[PDB]
Amino acid sequence: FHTGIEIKVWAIACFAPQRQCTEVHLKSFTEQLRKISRDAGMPIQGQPCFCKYAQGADSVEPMFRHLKNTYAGLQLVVVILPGKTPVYAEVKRVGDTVLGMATQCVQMKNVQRTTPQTLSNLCLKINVKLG
Amino acid sequence: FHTGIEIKVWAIACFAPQRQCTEVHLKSFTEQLRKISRDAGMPIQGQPCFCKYAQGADSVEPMFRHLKNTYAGLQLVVVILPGKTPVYAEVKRVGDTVLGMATQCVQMKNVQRTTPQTLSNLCLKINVKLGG
Amino acid sequence: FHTGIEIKVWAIACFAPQRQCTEVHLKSFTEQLRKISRDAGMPIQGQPCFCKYAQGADSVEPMFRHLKNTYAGLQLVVVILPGKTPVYAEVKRVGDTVLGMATQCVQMKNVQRTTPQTLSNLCLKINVKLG
Ligand SMILES: O=c1ccn([C@@H]2O[C@H](COP(=O)(O)O)[C@@H](O)[C@H]2O)c(=O)[nH]1
Ligand SMILES: O=c1ccn([C@@H]2O[C@H](COP(=O)(O)O)[C@@H](O)[C@H]2O)c(=O)[nH]1
Ligand SMILES: O=c1ccn([C@@H]2O[C@H](COP(=O)(O)O)[C@@H](O)[C@H]2O)c(=O)[nH]1
């Protein structure tokens, strides 16, 4: 576990349908993630700079290019996925290989229904990536 | 207060549920405890040899017997408790009077959110128990 | 894979229609699951303490509160679903975020006709949840 991470600039890209994963689900998930990440000493600080819905792997690269060009110092994009989807492989291709932007994927189900254990799982994955 | 302590073999036993004291809490607490104990000349070294959840006073003795048999040279078990619990008296009965195993209890609120002052409080207790 | 799990108190809630997933299908599935779980060293011990049909997402919260209020030490509710259904999200809403009750869902088609591979699939998922 890496100490000293501070996530100041971060975004949400929700590829799950808004009807399943609504804005108030995203906001409640955000506040719970902020609380546990701060308590664990890897604070995800502030609201996300960007939080939008998209659909389809074909929307990943245009969205991620916009994010990279628009938010200097963006440190992480949290990517919400509707279960098993080609969006995952495209997010990793665009983020890790095309553009060089850290992404952390999370299942829609764990945003719809947050629990401490799944938030913890997510923080540990983010810690590996950013530490 | 004793200088020159080195805690090389140590375990974590968490008797609060994972939903209350999650894996990221345990790992962050471990790393913060390693850092301050090293700076204060009583380093708790490395990763714990064992870090598991259990529930209820009845689980204490089998777990501690397992620990004593499995990890030779075990110097300390850090025991995470939710607060007041019968598990505390049983930890001390088994560790202090049955198996001769050092234990240090800590409340989950100070694992969920560490601070320098509460980690210092805990290191002072550990130093009393193990110094010398 | 976790060793040392023993499932002593568990329930079945069947949201699939009885005319598709009958009592003999449920008993067969139960007994086959018990045998393979023992093979694998995660014995599901005893018959379920409760095995009933349920109709609709509206039945989830009343039934799960009834289970919590009636069976001390309940470890798992195995939930049989008729394919894709809103019942799934409600089961997880109640179990994971209201009452703190472990649930394992299974598709009705794999209760109507079990195979060792689908029983194994289910055992692995239970093992992760309870481990
Ligand atoms: O199709 C997929 C593939 C992975 N995932 C999730 O992505 C997560 C891994 O994301 P990561 O590689 O950014 O760490 C993991 O929790 C998977 O469950 C999906 O939701 N859908
Ligand atoms: O039932 C109890 C008793 C003590 N404790 C805590 O145990 C700590 C002392 O542990 P110790 O005896 O191992 O030094 C102290 O911080 C108490 O707050 C509990 O959490 N529960
Ligand atoms: O609407 C749904 C959603 C999931 N399921 C099944 O639920 C299972 C997942 O259950 P779990 O989340 O309890 O592990 C998986 O086998 C899915 O196919 C349904 O049968 N219907």
- The DSSP string of A59-101 is GHHHHHHHHHHHSTT--EEEEEE-SS-THHHHHHIIIIIII--
> Which tokens go with C11?
């329930």
* Burial of C95: CB neighbours in 10 Å, binned 0-12, 13-18, 19+: buried
* Distances B76 to A36, B69, C130 between C-alpha atoms, Å: 28, 14, 28
- The DSSP string of B11-55 is EEEE-S-TTTS-HHHHHHHHHHHHHHHHHTT--B-SS-SEEEE--
* In a domain? residue A115: yes
Pairwise CB contact (< 8 Å): A109 & C93? no
Measured distance CA(A22)–CA(C89) in Å, rounded: 14
> Which tokens go with C102?
């472990």
Angle value at C-alpha A119, between A117 and A120, nearest 5 degrees: 60
* In a domain? residue C5: no
> Which tokens go with C77?
């509710």
* In a domain? residue C2: no
* Backbone angles phi and psi of C48, in degrees to 5: -65, 150
Best residue for ligand 3 mutational test, from C93, C94, C106 (most atoms within 8 Å of Cβ): C106
Q: Using a CB–CB cutoff of 8 Å, tell me whether A28 touches chain C.
A: no
CATH number of the CATH domain containing A71: 3.40.50.2300
| CB-defined site of ligand 2, < 6 Å | B 81, 83-85, 88, 103-105, 107, 125
* In a domain? residue B5: no
C-alpha of residue B80 to centroid of ligand 2, in Å: 9
* Burial of A5: CB neighbours in 10 Å, binned 0-12, 13-18, 19+: buried
Do B52 and B14 form a contact (C-beta atoms < 8 A)? yes
Measured distance CA(B59)–CA(B32) in Å, rounded: 28
* Backbone angles phi and psi of A40, in degrees to 5: -85, 5
* In a domain? residue B39: yes
Q: Which residue of A42, A115, A124 is in closest CB contact with B19?
A: A115
Measured distance CA(B110)–CA(B117) in Å, rounded: 10
Q: Which residue has the tokens 């108190």?
A: C9
Measured distance CA(B59)–CA(B91) in Å, rounded: 10
Helix then strand count (H, E) for chain C reads 5, 4
Measured distance CA(B64)–CA(B95) in Å, rounded: 8
Q: Which atom of ligand 3 is least distant from the CA of C86?
A: 1
Domain extent at residue C62 = 10-130
* In a domain? residue B2: no
Report the SS3 class of residue C19: coil
CA distance A9 to chain C (A): 29
Q: CB within 8 A of C116, min separation 6: which ones?
A: C36
Do B108 and B132 form a contact (C-beta atoms < 8 A)? no
Going across the sheet that includes B76-81, the strands are B50-53, B10-14, B76-81, B103-107
* In a domain? residue B132: no
* In a domain? residue C92: yes
| Domains of chain B: total | 1
Tell me the technique behind this structure: X-ray
CA distance B35 to chain A (A): 10
Measured distance CA(C77)–CA(C79) in Å, rounded: 6
A103, A107, A15, A108: which is closest to A59 by C-alpha? A15
Q: Which atom of ligand 2 is least distant from the CA of B89?
A: 1
